[PDB]
RNA sequence: GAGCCGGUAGCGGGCGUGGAUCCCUGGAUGUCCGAAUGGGGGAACCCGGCCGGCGGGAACGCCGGUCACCGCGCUUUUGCGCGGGGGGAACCUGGGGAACUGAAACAUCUCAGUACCCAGAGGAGAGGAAAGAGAAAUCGACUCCCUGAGUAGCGGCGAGCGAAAGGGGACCAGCCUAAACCGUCCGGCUUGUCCGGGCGGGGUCGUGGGGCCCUCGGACACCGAAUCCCCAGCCUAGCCGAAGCUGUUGGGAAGCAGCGCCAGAGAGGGUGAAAGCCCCGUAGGCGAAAGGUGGGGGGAUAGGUGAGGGUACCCGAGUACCCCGUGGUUCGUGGAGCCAUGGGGGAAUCUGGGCGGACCACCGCCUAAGGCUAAGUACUCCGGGUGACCGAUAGCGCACCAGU
RNA sequence: CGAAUGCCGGCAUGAGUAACGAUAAAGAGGGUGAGAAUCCCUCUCGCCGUAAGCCCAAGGGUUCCUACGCAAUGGUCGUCAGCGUAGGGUUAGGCGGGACCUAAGGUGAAGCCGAAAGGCGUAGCCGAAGGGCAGCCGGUUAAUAUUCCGGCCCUUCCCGCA
RNA sequence: CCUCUAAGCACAACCUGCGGGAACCCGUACCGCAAACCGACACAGGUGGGCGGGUGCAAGAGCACUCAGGCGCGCGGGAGA
């Protein structure tokens, strides 16, 4: 457990397929993709209980680090 | 104690004096009759059956272990030779003279 | 804790062994020149002498302490 | 069914110690014994362990 | 209750009615490995500090004991004192998560959220008092059975896949918490009026709380645990416990024969060949604890909530909502929503805000964006019973010096 | 249930033909035995001999000696065995491993990145007939030996005092 | 082995002498260019190091014969197509 982004988990599930559309606009469409992948935000450096450094991601982190809920920067 | 089997179960494998509820049996007329509780797996006793049915004999070894026991009368000879104890089945021992001459024995069952 | 030494180890040779010198025996397997050599010490009039020792696969340990100079007396 | 719990339990701690000791050197003895194969069965060797055995029992009880 | 040193029958020697063997529970030991954790390491073996006796140290010197891994809080101080982990046949939930095969190919699809692998809680977890349901202005935990429907319907509409509210049933119960407002204050900035956190106010069930003014009003409402001893159930052994003998063919009889009894216990087995009365410590039934686990049920412990109007209002979340890109769902991109989110925008606190499947008007419904919640369904290592189940090439493959 | 080159298990086939595991050979004498081409002593002889040598180790691991004994193993025997039963047999301050040293390489508090199991990894540890390090030759049983005996040469660590 | 902190000796530290004392944990037996090691068998397979005795050969672990030590291969007789 060491990707997340300690306020809030963001990583995981996710699956992309493709098909050929052209539907609502006249006709249906067709299905093609089956597959799996990741998702994610962006961390960066703050502090906590002497020491510590962070990570988290982006959102929370705009969040978080304009104040802070279980530690600080 | 609710099926064919249990019966060996609690019989030998829990109380050996479970195997002396085996020793139990009965004797003669007067203590009989007189009765029915306490006994001296060690007393005097005939053979009601077996060729040797209506046969004669003294308990010596109440011998609960292999499940039966020994009277001096219910007797066998070897082939080389010497004489020797057969192995009594419980089943038919008759007790009479009830062995009692011992204080105890009086006691626990007349 | 407690106890100490195993027994007497006869075998032809062990008997004479004892007998013209040293004597060899029964030890557990613990114990050593320290601890074994004591147990002995302790027991047999005589003190440490001298020790040598090996196993088996069987069980029991053999040790060898050779003589105090003194006593040992035929049957161990 | 001899010696005794308590009455031992009397018998102080460093005494419980002495008389172990013994305890242990004379059945060596008979140890050394069985070997020779001099002597017989003591129902004895068995039980010396025991009473040992016990006394080490209780004593460890009572608290060293 | 009177025999015993176990399966070894044998020898050689021994213990016990001054309740032995053994059944039970509650004891001390408890070598060395295995989370292994003191250190190392091809486990079961080899290495280290203090206490330790003082040990032979015959005129010479030990084992034993013991003792310290690391992740966990935090009384922080120099950190002392807590919890963890390692299991587990199958059961649970979540993390991750597939080909064959069917479509008579095969790319959608089905096999399935199936197999497996994982983390983890348990004895059961699941989940579980509503931004629900549905619409008769009706319903109100969560779960599990039947029923609803193989309906409503999803879909190269091709194989196939396929619900739910309502009815019946088992069960039944409910509680908080930030939620700044109040005050308490601590600790701060640097004194004000700032956030801060330990205390209570409230600490919302179906919407209020708080704060102001007067009505208040002045005792039976216990959960999931807390508590008593209760039947604490069981934990193994508890113990009573009805009544035939003579004859007789018999190697044996319990059988043939004569006469005799039992009986809420003619369940079955053991008895030299088939007995209600011979053995059976069986069904008749009574039985019974100083230990180790309950519901019931009893009490106080009892925690703990429990009224009136007013007033300009401040009071459960960081994100709903929207756009893209996926999930569940019966929905296969679709007229296609609800919830859940990946990435960017980034609201409103009661005329708030989602909801009733595009959307718009009106109505009806709920009050999210924190938490706990025994019981009603699953499961079988283990104990019991029972079987138109098996008889050793059948049963688990293994009925006994077999997962060897 | 012939009947699925069926599964299980017995049981016959060729067949008393085929084979005895290297064309490095044997023969005689006596000995022991219930019985010996197939064991023991012994005298003719053949084959190695760079090996069919003895040794260190690797691996196996009681197989070794000694008294017994042969049912099966021993591709014939077999009183022989590296077969069976039982007894007994391998001792080191200085041989060797450790009780020391490290590269590879592994571990690896810290540190680094994973969906979870993970990855990677400092230093420290593990990790060798690579480093290191204090003696040898005679003797002596059924067996062991640079360890037992003895002679001769040492080593480290300790208390003391100089 | 020398150079040195911390440091502690520094009439008590290291080096050096002599005397008394002390010295452990696992290992060997036999096989072992092999019926005892791998090939499922006493299977003419392979399997790391040590001079490898001598005579002859131009030299030599090649060759023929032998030394020490080893072995006669584990079925034997008998005809001879």
Same mark, same amino acid.
């Given at each position: 457990m060491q990707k997340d982004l300690h306020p809030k988990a963001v990583p995981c599930?996710?699956?992309?397929?493709?098909?050929?559309?052209?539907?609502?606009?006249?006709?249906?469409?067709?299905?093609?993709?089956?597959?799996w992948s990741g998702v994610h935000p962006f961390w960066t450096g703050e502090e906590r209980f002497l020491d510590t450094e962070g990570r988290v991601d982006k959102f929370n982190k705009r969040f978080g680090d304009s104040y802070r809920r279980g530690s600080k920067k | 104690s609710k099926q064919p089997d249990k019966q060996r179960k609690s019989q030998?494998?829990?109380?050996l004096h479970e195997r002396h509820k085996?020793?139990?049996?009965?004797?003669?007329?007067?203590?009989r009759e007189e009765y029915g509780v306490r006994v001296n797996a060690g007393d005097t006793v005939e053979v009601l059956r077996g060729d040797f049915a209506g046969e004669e004999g003294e308990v010596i070894n109440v011998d609960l272990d292999k499940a039966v026991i020994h009277v001096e009368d219910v007797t066998l000879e070897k082939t080389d030779g010497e004489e020797?104890?057969?192995?009594?089945?419980?089943?038919?021992?008759?007790?009479?003279?009830?062995?009692?001459?011992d204080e105890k024995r009086e006691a626990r069952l007349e | 804790s407690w106890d100490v030494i195993k027994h007497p180890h006869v075998t032809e040779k062990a008997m004479n062994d004892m007998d013209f010198n040293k004597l060899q025996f029964a030890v557990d397997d613990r114990a050593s020149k320290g601890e074994v050599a004591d147990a002995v010490e302790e027991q047999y009039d005589v003190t440490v002498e001298?020790?040598?020792?090996?196993?088996?696969?069987?069980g029991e340990k053999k040790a060898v302490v050779r003589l105090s100079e003194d006593d040992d007396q035929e049957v161990a | 069914t001899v010696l005794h719990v308590q009455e031992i339990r009397?018998?102080? +701690?460093?005494?419980?110690?002495?008389?172990?000791?013994?305890?242990?050197?004379?059945?060596?003895?008979?140890?050394? &014994?069985?070997?020779?194969?001099? +002597?017989?069965n003591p129902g004895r060797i068995k039980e010396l362990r025991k009473a040992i055995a016990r006394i080490k029992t209780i &004593?460890?009880?009572?608290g060293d």
């Open positions: 599930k996710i699956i992309y397929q493709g098909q050929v559309v052209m539907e609502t606009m006249s006709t249906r469409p067709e299905i093609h993709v089956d597959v | 030998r494998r829990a109380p085996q020793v139990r049996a009965t004797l003669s007329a007067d203590l020797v104890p057969r192995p009594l089945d419980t089943s038919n021992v008759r007790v009479t003279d009830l062995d009692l001459e | 001298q020790v040598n020792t090996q196993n088996t696969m069987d | 009397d018998m102080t +701690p460093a005494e419980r110690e002495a008389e172990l000791d013994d305890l242990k050197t004379e059945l060596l003895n008979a140890r050394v &014994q069985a070997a020779g194969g001099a +002597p017989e &004593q460890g009880e009572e």
